[PDB]
Amino acid sequence: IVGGQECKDGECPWQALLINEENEGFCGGTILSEFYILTAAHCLYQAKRFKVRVGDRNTEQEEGGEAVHEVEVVIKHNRFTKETYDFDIAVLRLKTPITFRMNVAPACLPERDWAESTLMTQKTGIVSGFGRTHERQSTRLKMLEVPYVDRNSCKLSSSFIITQNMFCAGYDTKQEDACQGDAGGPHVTRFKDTYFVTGIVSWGEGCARKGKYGIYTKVTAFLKWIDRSMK
């Protein structure tokens, strides 16, 4: 995350970290249930093999309530393409159930129509992760408030096609954005002190560049696919 703040104790308990063979974090995830993690499809092409860490906040100091879960099942969206990053979504089923505790709790899946009318129409959402702090990876979990950006502005701003499975969030010139390493992580929207999954960190042209935004997988278009993928 570029700019933003640290996640303080218990503030981002739905954050998951995908970790490769050398225990290096490379992508984020969002805890949905005891067995299921939401992530980006393109994150499945970064590491040879990986596990999911949850309940982590400072990677440098591994003492506390962190736990690494092995992935039983990967459920990538059949329509994902790396040429466009369209359908940038996957669901991981874990071999072992997550024990919810301090810093380990799922984000809520909203109903679609309500999500569209009530969450997507909010001023801002919250993105989080362990990724780089400029365009390089944070040792501490960070969060950032990102304004929703209208589709027409987003499309004009972009060098790549913005599909209906994507939305923009962040700032025109202000040096705040997600970055490399945050992909697959949570974009959640707050409504009366309850946080609902609204996006997946997908891609951006660099990080915090002027006249560019963060591109997120529009979770509302995938709520049905998610339900299916959670059995």
Partner: protein
């Protein structure tokens, strides 16, 4: 209805037979008042953790 302050619902609001209907995400129960959402267990979805 649902455009007037979410129909007074804590979470989901839907318009049904000219009337508001509130509902809640899995892991919540609808309160007696038909509007508030009540956690069933200690770690309900979407809540920042305190202990």
């Amino acid at each position: 209805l649902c455009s007037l302050d979410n129909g007074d619902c804590d979470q989901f609001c839907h318009e049904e037979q000219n009337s508001v209907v509130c509902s809640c995400a899995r892991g919540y129960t609808l309160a007696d008042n038909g509007k508030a959402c009540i956690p069933t267990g200690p770690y309900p979805c979407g809540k920042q953790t305190l202990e």
